[PDB]
Amino acid sequence: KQEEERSKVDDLRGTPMSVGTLEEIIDDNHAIVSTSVGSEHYVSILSFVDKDLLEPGCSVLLNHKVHAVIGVLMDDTDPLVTVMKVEQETYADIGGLDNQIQEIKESVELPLTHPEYYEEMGIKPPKGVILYGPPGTGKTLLAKAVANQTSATFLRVVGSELIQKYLGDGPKLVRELFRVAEEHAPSIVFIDEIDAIGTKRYDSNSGGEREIQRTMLELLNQLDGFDSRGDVKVIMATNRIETLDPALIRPGRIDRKIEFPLPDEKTKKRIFQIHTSRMTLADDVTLDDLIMAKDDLSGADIKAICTEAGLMALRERRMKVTNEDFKKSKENVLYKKQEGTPEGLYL
Amino acid sequence: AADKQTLQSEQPLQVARCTKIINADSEDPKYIINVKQFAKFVVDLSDQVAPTDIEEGMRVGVDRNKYQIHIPLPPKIDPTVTYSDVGGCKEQIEKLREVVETPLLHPERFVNLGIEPPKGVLLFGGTGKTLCARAVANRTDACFIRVIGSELVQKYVGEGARMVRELFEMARTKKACLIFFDEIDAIGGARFDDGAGGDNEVQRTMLELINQLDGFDPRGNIKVLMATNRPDTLDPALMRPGRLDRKIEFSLPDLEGRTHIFKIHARSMSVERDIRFELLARLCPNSTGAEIRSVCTEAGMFAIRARRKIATEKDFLEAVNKVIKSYAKFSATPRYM
Amino acid sequence: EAVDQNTAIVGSTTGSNYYVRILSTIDRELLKPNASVALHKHSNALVDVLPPEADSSIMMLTSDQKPDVMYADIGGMDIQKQEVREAVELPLTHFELYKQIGIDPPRGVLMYGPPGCGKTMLAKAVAHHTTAAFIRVVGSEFVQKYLGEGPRMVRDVFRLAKENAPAIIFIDEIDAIATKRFDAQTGADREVQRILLELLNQMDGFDQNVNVKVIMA
Amino acid sequence: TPNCRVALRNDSYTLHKILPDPLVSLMMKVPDSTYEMIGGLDKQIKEIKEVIELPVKHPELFEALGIAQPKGVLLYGPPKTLLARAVAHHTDCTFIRVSGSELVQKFIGEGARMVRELFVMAREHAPSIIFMDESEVQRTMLELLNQLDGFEATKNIKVIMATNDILDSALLRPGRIDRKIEFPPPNEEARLDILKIHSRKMNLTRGINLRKIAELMPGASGAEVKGVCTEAGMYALVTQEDFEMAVAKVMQKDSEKNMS
Amino acid sequence: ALLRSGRLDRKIEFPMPNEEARARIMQIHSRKMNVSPDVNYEELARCTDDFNGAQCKAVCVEAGMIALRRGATELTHEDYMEGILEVQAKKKANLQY
Numbered sequence A: 001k002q003e004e005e006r007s008k009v010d011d012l013r014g015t016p017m018s019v020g021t022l023e024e025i026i027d028d029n030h031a032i033v034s035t036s037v038g039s040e041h042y043v044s045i046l047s048f049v050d051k052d053l054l055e056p057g058c059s060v061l062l063n064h065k066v067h068a069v070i071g072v073l074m075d076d077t078d079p080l081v082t083v084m085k086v087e088q089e090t091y092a093d094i095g096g097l098d099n100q101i102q103e104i105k106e107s108v109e110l111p112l113t114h115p116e117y118y119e120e121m122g123i124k125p126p127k128g129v130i131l132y133g134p135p136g137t138g139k140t141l142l143a144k145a146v147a148n149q150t151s152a153t154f155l156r157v158v159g160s161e162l163i164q165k166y167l168g169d170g171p172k173l174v175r176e177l178f179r180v181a182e183e184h185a186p187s188i189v190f191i192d193e194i195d196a197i198g199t200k201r202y203d204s205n206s207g208g209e210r211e212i213q214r215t216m217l218e219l220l221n222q223l224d225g226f227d228s229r230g231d232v233k234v235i236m237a238t239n240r241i242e243t244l245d246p247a248l249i250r251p252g253r254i255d256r257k258i259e260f261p262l263p264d265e266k267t268k269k270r271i272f273q274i275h276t277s278r279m280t281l282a283d284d285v286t287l288d289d290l291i292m293a294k295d296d297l298s299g300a301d302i303k304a305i306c307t308e309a310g311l312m313a314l315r316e317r318r319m320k321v322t323n324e325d326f327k328k329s330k331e332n333v334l335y336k337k338q339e340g341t342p343e344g345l346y347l
Numbered sequence B: 001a002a003d004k005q006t007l008q009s010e011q012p013l014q015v016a017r018c019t020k021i022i023n024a025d026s027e028d029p030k031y032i033i034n035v036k037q038f039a040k041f042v043v044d045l046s047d048q049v050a051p052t053d054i055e056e057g058m059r060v061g062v063d064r065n066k067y068q069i070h071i072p073l074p075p076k077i078d079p080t081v082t083y084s085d086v087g088g089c090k091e092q093i094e095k096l097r098e099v100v101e102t103p104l105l106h107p108e109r110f111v112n113l114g115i116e117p118p119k120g121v122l123l124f125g126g127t128g129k130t131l132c133a134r135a136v137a138n139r140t141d142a143c144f145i146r147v148i149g150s151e152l153v154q155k156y157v158g159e160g161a162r163m164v165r166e167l168f169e170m171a172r173t174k175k176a177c178l179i180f181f182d183e184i185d186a187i188g189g190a191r192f193d194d195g196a197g198g199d200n201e202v203q204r205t206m207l208e209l210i211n212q213l214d215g216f217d218p219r220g221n222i223k224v225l226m227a228t229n230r231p232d233t234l235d236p237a238l239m240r241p242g243r244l245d246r247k248i249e250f251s252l253p254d255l256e257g258r259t260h261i262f263k264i265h266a267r268s269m270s271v272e273r274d275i276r277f278e279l280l281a282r283l284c285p286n287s288t289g290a291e292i293r294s295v296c297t298e299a300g301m302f303a304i305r306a307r308r309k310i311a312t313e314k315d316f317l318e319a320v321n322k323v324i325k326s327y328a329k330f331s332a333t334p335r336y337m
Numbered sequence C: 001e002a003v004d005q006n007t008a009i010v011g012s013t014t015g016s017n018y019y020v021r022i023l024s025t026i027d028r029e030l031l032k033p034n035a036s037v038a039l040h041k042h043s044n045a046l047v048d049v050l051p052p053e054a055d056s057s058i059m060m061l062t063s064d065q066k067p068d069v070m071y072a073d074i075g076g077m078d079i080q081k082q083e084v085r086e087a088v089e090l091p092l093t094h095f096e097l098y099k100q101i102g103i104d105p106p107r108g109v110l111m112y113g114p115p116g117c118g119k120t121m122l123a124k125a126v127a128h129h130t131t132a133a134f135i136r137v138v139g140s141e142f143v144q145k146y147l148g149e150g151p152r153m154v155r156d157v158f159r160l161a162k163e164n165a166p167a168i169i170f171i172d173e174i175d176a177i178a179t180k181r182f183d184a185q186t187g188a189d190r191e192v193q194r195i196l197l198e199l200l201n202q203m204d205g206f207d208q209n210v211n212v213k214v215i216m217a
Numbered sequence D: 001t002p003n004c005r006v007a008l009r010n011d012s013y014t015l016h017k018i019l020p021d022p023l024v025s026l027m028m029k030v031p032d033s034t035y036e037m038i039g040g041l042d043k044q045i046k047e048i049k050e051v052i053e054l055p056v057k058h059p060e061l062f063e064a065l066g067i068a069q070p071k072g073v074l075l076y077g078p079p080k081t082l083l084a085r086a087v088a089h090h091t092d093c094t095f096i097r098v099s100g101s102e103l104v105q106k107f108i109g110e111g112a113r114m115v116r117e118l119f120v121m122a123r124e125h126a127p128s129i130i131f132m133d134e135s136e137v138q139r140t141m142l143e144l145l146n147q148l149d150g151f152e153a154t155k156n157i158k159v160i161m162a163t164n165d166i167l168d169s170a171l172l173r174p175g176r177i178d179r180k181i182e183f184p185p186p187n188e189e190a191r192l193d194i195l196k197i198h199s200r201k202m203n204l205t206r207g208i209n210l211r212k213i214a215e216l217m218p219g220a221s222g223a224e225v226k227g228v229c230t231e232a233g234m235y236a237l238v239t240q241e242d243f244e245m246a247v248a249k250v251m252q253k254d255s256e257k258n259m260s
Numbered sequence E: 001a002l003l004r005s006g007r008l009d010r011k012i013e014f015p016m017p018n019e020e021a022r023a024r025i026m027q028i029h030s031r032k033m034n035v036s037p038d039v040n041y042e043e044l045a046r047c048t049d050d051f052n053g054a055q056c057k058a059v060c061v062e063a064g065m066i067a068l069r070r071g072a073t074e075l076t077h078e079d080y081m082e083g084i085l086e087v088q089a090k091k092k093a094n095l096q097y
């Protein structure tokens, strides 16, 4: 019966079930496998259990004695599903770009959700935008707020999440996440800090000249090359502009680009009231003095400064926060800051 | 269990690992091999094979013990390689027209002249190296096969040369073909040699190309195009009137090809006819067609913001503000007249 | 790592760590370090563990590398001659004269030989008159390809030094080695990184009972 | 359990049992001395308390607040190791100077693949210190971004680096380390207290002014009083003149006027 | 250090084709390609003095492609003079003031 069929399928299997990546679709009941060291014979492939479901370059079950194709690999999962396969919205504290929000909207949601305009005005959707600037000003923050502000299930993909030194694990995660983006849904595969090709290295990593080079080749051929977009929103924002390979600076790969200054007085007071709200404010302290002195508050000093000001105060268990506590909080946060002459020597 | 015992009956054979080839000896072939990465193997095949079906640079079957060559296979297969503009950069058009059609159409202007049919171009240049090949596709006959030298950057010895023969003979099957190799800057024109033991598949591949392009069944009703951004690194082997013999070039057109491409991309989308281009042309200081196409895209972005159908020169005005002031580099022009 | 009685997961030197049983009679309080265990080839059955291994390639040279020299024999360095003499040969062995003025247990020292000198010659003279476990090396030997080669070199040097006897050891290379200029992102990123890291981490501030007073010049 | 190195046989790879690699290589120890040689440089110790015992002493006072605890103070400045070790040593339970700092290219990354194994230890060993010094760096920085955001055994543990700051400035984002505290060297008051301290045990020529010695130290790096004691005793081999000549060896260069 | 006595012993120059050496190279280009024999290479070589091989080679190829323009079967001294009087790798001018 069926139990006997399963017992026979197990009879075909050798107790030590090695693992070998398929090389090519050759269906004369034998394939050309590649185990952890690349055992590539014309080993038989079990016919009844699906022999042709898995593609070439995919892990399958292998024998030990003859390394025969034992079967399709088990359901494997990458360590990023919880971040990518997603189970703050527009703005919980309006007071920042107040515009790049709208622009990433028009560049991602409007194209993706209603792509009935690119034939309405002979146009093409933005296949890629880059957003960059200081180490935290409103680049990835907007993307995080855009994840909730969308009619689609966004995906979070840390640029370093794709750094696994296993053989082809780079291309493996490319394949997995892209089979997601294409055969899960029209998703929002957001990948940040993707500028990691320029001027550093790792200890938990081998020679990148020949380890992640073909990995990036696979990733590029996947995203904006072959098996092209269609409607697969995978936009690549950054922080820098320089250290990158111009193989993608050319359009097509990515079309638009956006930067991020640091917020202005109008937005300084905004994010102040956003953060200074977390404490019973001693209103005699002058936010505007902090705003003009710290006139280049990317967005970390504001948060850190107000949190540490609350800490300074509530160390004394006071409700109000005198100005000196704010001074100490900021100056601890704000090291190495000398904005006087120059200049410094004028008006 | 539809075949749960035949697989247990196919068992009598387990041989022929990957076993790539290196080269071969004489007085007996003695083909040289590496299995996967282990070592070099100057093997003697299993005589029940062909002394030539084991062409070096192929993963052939080979004994698990004696390493004698067995039933091969190239499981590396084909999936490795990926016009109203007639009249562009003006001078380029005539030389291109001649080099393409006149041998393809009338081997009399040269053969009787004794000069040779111009059948090659040393192009160098937003220039449009592909758009020219496509305006040619309007004219060769109807054949246009894209093979970019970038994809041609492959890391398998002879696989490049094997693709050379593949493309060269697929072209010779058809006629009036087009084969567009670019990034010869990335490919190389001067025969740089390093003891790195690396980029030599390019070496064998390019010698095979020299063999198979022109002469030895030349392109004829086929055009195989290797061109550059710059004639910077040439070689005394390419200036041959048989391989590449026109040496055209183009760069940024002033405004006329510009205006033309403006109108091209305009009618290519929902635009307002009452707009002009020479005004926009003055706005355009220096740009490639894609940049200009990007202006069109930004006009489309405005027409996505505001409900526009015939994209007006005011939509294009904002698009110009963007591309040439808000995208000239960033924004750093104003505050001094 | 050990799991049960006389059975332990033990790092190999062949390419495959294993979890093997050991000869039980071995004192159970001796299998704690990653020391030189010894097992059978196939069985991989631990027989005993050895403390030492992999000398520091000079191992004090152990013979009579003593240049057989007295005080004045050096080519005229009376300042350094007297200084090293009475501030080393007496303090190197002493416990109470320093304490007779509560001075301190001493540590490293420095020389510099220009044209027409002999600063190194003084070092070799002392190397004669020193009669303990002193090992000689050159800092130049710390710069190779792979990770931490020279760093691990000096590390194991420190280990074996504090192990054998905290008496004396010396190394001779300062220039292009002890480079205070950590600041150029062009060349020797990881190289100068590991160089100066080993330098400072082995400075340790000091260690106060080891390898008393290496010099350089 | 997932990610468990367990009992397996090369014979037929039939899994046998479950086993619970380089723990001690980092987890291996300085029960140091007291503050007896600190003498006036105690405000930084107060800050040490405020920023280290606050993640330790009374969690019920800022968990009552509800806001996250601090991770790093960047105890930088004029090179600190000695006393920064010997001071919270008095806790003798949480001061675990594992610090991963020695083996930059071996213990870090290439073995601290994800240092979360050490974070695992910390989750078992809430009384543990985390000292640090100088893209692997940026990788472990991302590890920090994952962990020290008010998330550890004592929720912040002890995640601090110290150096003496021109590396990759990404860490300089306070969202990765909250405090940044240089080490102001001792001065007249502190220098004089440590003067009496470092002159305590040596059987000097007692009855001697140490204030001029503290002053002659222009903000000496703490233990320099001990070194001057060493220089003094050497001259005597301890009158005030001994320490005078001691600083004279110590302080000279600065010298060489004719450039006023 | 590169030319003394055993490395590159002799050092002889390649003088510019004087007057009719240029025409010699030119007819070497102008021999296979079918030519109308009404081509005196003497006038050609004379009316372009101080003209190196390359120029002359570019001249004869220009003349070949010129007869190719009309589609001729022969090379006329008109086209030869056209090559002689081509850009000669000279430009442009603006001429700008």
Ligand SMILES: Nc1ncnc2c1ncn2[C@@H]1O[C@H](COP(=O)(O)OP(=O)(O)OP(O)(O)=S)[C@@H](O)[C@H]1O
Pocket (backbone or CB within 6 Å): A091, A093, A094, A095, A096, A097, A098, A134, A135, A136, A137, A138, A139, A140, A141, A193, A239, A298, A299, A300, A303, D170, D173
């Ligand atoms: N609407 C907003 N516009 C601008 N800034 C905001 C806004 N809302 C919050 N912020 C602040 O901006 C910061 C966002 O920083 P992020 O860009 O998320 O940091 P990050 O992405 O880790 O930066 P790097 O480059 O990876 S170190 C937060 O700390 C907020 O305090």
Ligand SMILES: Nc1ncnc2c1ncn2[C@@H]1O[C@H](COP(=O)(O)OP(=O)(O)OP(O)(O)=S)[C@@H](O)[C@H]1O
Pocket (backbone or CB within 6 Å): A250, B085, B088, B089, B126, B127, B128, B129, B130, B131, B182, B261, B264, B288, B289, B290, B291, B293
């Ligand atoms: N001369 C032109 N005529 C018509 N369209 C053009 C022209 N130049 C650019 N374009 C358009 O602008 C886009 C630019 O593409 P390409 O010109 O292929 O880019 P490119 O980087 O110049 O290509 P290479 O490097 O020379 S192969 C194309 O999609 C064209 O449609």
Ligand SMILES: Nc1ncnc2c1ncn2[C@@H]1O[C@H](COP(=O)(O)OP(=O)(O)OP(O)(O)=S)[C@@H](O)[C@H]1O
Pocket (backbone or CB within 6 Å): C075, C113, C114, C115, C116, C117, C118, C119, C120, C121, C122
């Ligand atoms: N008085 C001397 N008699 C014989 N050899 C001497 C004398 N002084 C120096 N030397 C030579 O110098 C070496 C020892 O002197 P060192 O102190 O090493 O010289 P130095 O100061 O390092 O100068 P360098 O290294 O040559 S630039 C020996 O190998 C001797 O050959």
